[PDB]
Amino acid sequence: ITPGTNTSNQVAVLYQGVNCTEVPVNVFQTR
Amino acid sequence: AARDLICAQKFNGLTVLPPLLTDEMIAQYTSALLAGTITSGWTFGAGAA
Numbered sequence: 001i002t003p004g005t006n007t008s009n010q011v012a013v014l015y016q017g018v019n020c021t022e023v024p025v026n027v028f029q030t031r
Numbered sequence: 032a033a034r035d036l037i038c039a040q041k042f043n044g045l046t047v048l049p050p051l052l053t054d055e056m057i058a059q060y061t062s063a064l065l066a067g068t069i070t071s072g073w074t075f076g077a078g079a080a
């Protein structure tokens with residue numbers, strides 16, 4: 001999830017259908 | 032002991048993304064439309080209520 005590269009180079013990562021307590025291979029929890 | 036068959040699709044890579052609007056948001060839209068229709072007839076579709 002990113003804005004345009006003309007704006008910034010900062011991104012966010014969404015792991016689909018993954019509980020955060022088991023995320024590894026801020027932190028918010030969504031549906 | 033029994034696979035629910037959603038797990039087979041998930042293990043083979045067939046997933047389902049959630050909808051953007053929740054059922055609470057859909058119910059809020061229907062409540063807003065219903066309350067506007069009851070209170071103001073048809074004028075809220077044109078201008079203000």
Ligand SMILES: *[C@@H]1O[C@H](CO)[C@@H](O)[C@H](O)[C@H]1NC(C)=O
Pocket residue numbers: 019020021029
């Ligand atoms: C992750 O799974 C555990 C399993 O018991 C659950 O208790 C926990 O609430 C889950 N995490 C979130 C953020 O719901």
